[PDB]
Copies of this chain bind each other. A is one copy, B any other.
């Protein structure tokens, strides 16, 4: 009979059970039960202890994560974890020999190691320390330095700089072992001329003088970092002296101007594919290079080049898709936009220029998951024509007309959103269901796709939620200009359309994003609907993804227009449904959602009463180049400079006199710098409009500190409750 309180959300009273496993072979995986690392047999479900939970309570340090070598002879323990950016971090590492049950004390991995990674097979080790690459053949023998140009904030070897980590590779690592560990392919980034973003870091109050953090950050139109690619043979490190790292340059179509390295994928033991991207991200080229046995060099024939361009915007969703090569490495499958604007799987020959689409329709393929000699497993939103749904399909390679869905009918009521984790050779796979019901985990056999057992069904959480007045979720669409636009609402319990509720428009609306899906969540919206009786609505307008290039490319070179206007129009549609209080419609958003929310509140529409903007973008010349230029081009007069200045929130400061505005931003935000919100407030002051503000000391773009997280949602809860007059 209780509601879902703010305390329940902040104190995490109702936890979603998970089942995170790590496949070590084609029929075995690892799992943590009572902090004991168990090894399971997928065929029969029985397990055995692989590492006791008391083995490392004598360690003296709180182990943050482990990493077992593929051959099972060693395990890398990382401690003193200190987060850096979204993916990068710094920590200490120790190697534990499993054939001796002892810690490695000789030739320990150096402190301040920036990244560690095992080889795909065996137990080789490559790590980045002081921006240089080292390789250890044995965990206890001395290392072999590979790079020598590594310089702080200038030269990156084996690791990415800020932009590449965030906007290109989505990872800190810039290393790529060959399939059997023979070769080590790495990239080198040079941020010599890249300007530095500078902001104060205050740290603990014991620090007398504030600290100044300086990070190479290429803003829109600024000097980008350069990149070089290398491949070194780690087998020659025995008679190493100074091992030679062979360089692979970019095609001539990329050397004419600024470019990026956007994908690295090995095909065979002696074949690696590289995808390059121009700074004008509408033209990318895949390069397939084979290892020359006699020359010791790498050669990429022009006949094996593959160009992927776009005539109505950028190429790919956030980057050119990654290829999935067959066993022989002479052909690959890749997601690309077809002539109708829908992204499907195309079959490429390593030699032929034209590819053949194996899937088609008014829907898109989210990703390729596994490839065997028989079938290719992919995820898509084809089922019931719902762009917000995810299901695992299986397409027959010998006949593209034989497509079977493996998750559509497992539980259509409870499960409409799926992810999959296949075994080493696609013999088994774990299906991850995340909505609209409670999460469900199941194991399966690829021989006939039978359900072996249920790993986790959240039956414990289901019982707790029975005596709780949980909200309901409606997933539907509206029609704007003969086009379906999907939306979702978190409806308060005992929803009655005879009444009129307050409306909170939860907004992100970033390019190729999706806010209306079938995923089940326990977040701030759950509390606002359950306890405060507030409808939390989300709307996927123009610019959202997984619906075709016609919608996703609608905001190309025009950020802050249709995306913003579609959110305002969505509010008008909701109020015209009967159960929305017109004088109590709010809007809030984080990151890109903060930018859209600010542009909405400064549009003079009069639709919204109040609004919250957390870590918002103010003007796009303040954001990084690779992301901004992808959708906005260059901020030069001969290019899209006119809209760079026409789409700032500062230029709408006057309209903020009609709304109640709350601006929040972390002082240590490395992504969307505090500069952005500092310019918003100063513009509002210059025109004399009052607003509420809140900075968070040393919090970054996530404001994920346990105390800060509880403090921000508490502060936003009061602002929303007072705006709606809710006691």
Partner-B contacts on A (CB < 8 A): 195-200, 202, 205, 208-212, 219-222, 619, 621-622, 648, 650, 667, 673-675, 678-679, 681-688, 690, 692-698, 705, 707-708, 710-711, 714-715, 718
Q: Is the CB of B199 within 8 A of A209?
A: no
Chain B nearest Cβ from A507, distance in angstroms: 24
Q: List 24 A-B contacts (CB under 8 A).
A: A195-B208, A197-B209, A198-B210, A198-B212, A199-B200, A200-B200, A200-B674, A205-B619, A205-B648, A208-B220, A208-B222, A208-B621, A678-B697, A678-B698, A682-B697, A682-B698, A685-B696, A685-B707, A687-B707, A690-B714, A690-B718, A692-B694, A693-B694, A695-B695
Is A209 in contact with B219, judged by CB distance below 8 angstroms? yes
- Which of B220, B679, B693, B708 contacts A205 (CB under 8 A)? B679
CB distance from A322 to the nearest CB of B (A): 33
A183 to B619, CA, bound (A): 56
- Residues in B with CB closer than 8 Å to A693 are 693-695
Contact present for A695 and B714 (CB under 8 Å): no
Chain B residues within 8 Å of A210, by CB: 197-199, 673, 675, 678
8 Å CB contact of A675 from B202, B685, B692, B707:
B202
Question: Which has the most chain B C-beta neighbours within 10 Å: A210, A673, A682?
Answer: A682
Contact (Cβ within 8 A) B690 A707: no
Q: Residues of B contacting A674 with CB < 8 Å?
A: 200
Query: How far is it, in angstroms, between the C-alpha of A648 and the C-alpha of B208 when the chains are bound?
Result: 13
Q: Are B682 and A202 in contact (CB under 8 A)?
A: yes
Question: If the complex has contacts A222-B208, A675-B210, are A711 and B696 also in contact, measured as CB distance less than 8 A?
Answer: no
Chain B residues whose CB sits within 8 angstroms of the CB of A209 once the complex forms: 195-198, 219
CA distance A686 to B707 in the complex (A): 5
Q: Residue on B with the closest CB to A214?
A: B212
**Assembly CA distance A681 to B665 (angstroms):** 13
Given A200-B674, A208-B219, output 17 extra A-B contacts at Cβ < 8 Å: A197-B209, A198-B209, A199-B200, A200-B200, A202-B678, A202-B682, A205-B648, A208-B220, A210-B678, A667-B678, A678-B698, A681-B695, A685-B707, A685-B708, A688-B707, A692-B694, A693-B693
Q: Which residues of B sit under 8 angstroms from A714, Cβ to Cβ?
A: 688, 690
CB neighbours (8 Å) of A219 from chain B are 208-209
Contacts of A198 in B (CB 8 A): 200, 209-212
CA of A650 to CA of B667 in the docked complex: distance in angstroms? Answer: 18
Considering the chains assembled together, what is the distance between the CA atoms of A197 and B208 in angstroms? 10
A697 to chain B, nearest CB (A): 4
| CA gap between A684 and B710 in the complex, in Å | 12
| Complex: A413 Cα to B205 Cα, angstroms | 52
Tell me whether A622 and B208 are in contact in the complex, defined as CB-CB below 8 angstroms, given that A675-B200, A682-B697 are known contacts. yes
Residues of B within 8 A of A707 (CB): 685-688
Nearest CB of B to A214, in Å:
8
Q: Check if A688 sits within 8 Å of B710, measured CB to CB.
A: yes
Contact: B695 with A205, CB < 8 Å?
A: no
Contacts of A675 in B (CB 8 A): 200, 202, 210
Chain B residues in 8 Å Cβ range of A708: 685
A615 to B712, CA, bound (A): 23
In the bound complex, CA of A210 to CA of B686 (Å): 19
Name the distance in Å between A580's Cβ and chain B's nearest Cβ. 28
CB distance from A456 to the nearest CB of B (A): 33
How many angstroms between the C-alpha atoms of A267 and B300 in the bound complex? 88
Contacts of A673 in B (CB 8 A): 210
| A688 partner, pick from B202, B685, B711, beta carbons under 8 A | B711
CA–CA, A228 to B185, complex, Å?
Answer: 61
Contacts of A200 in B (CB 8 A): 198-200, 674-675
Residues from chain B with Cβ under 8 Å of A710 in the complex = 688
B-side contacts of A697, CB under 8 Å: 678-679, 681-682, 685
Complex CA gap A715/B692 in Å reads 9
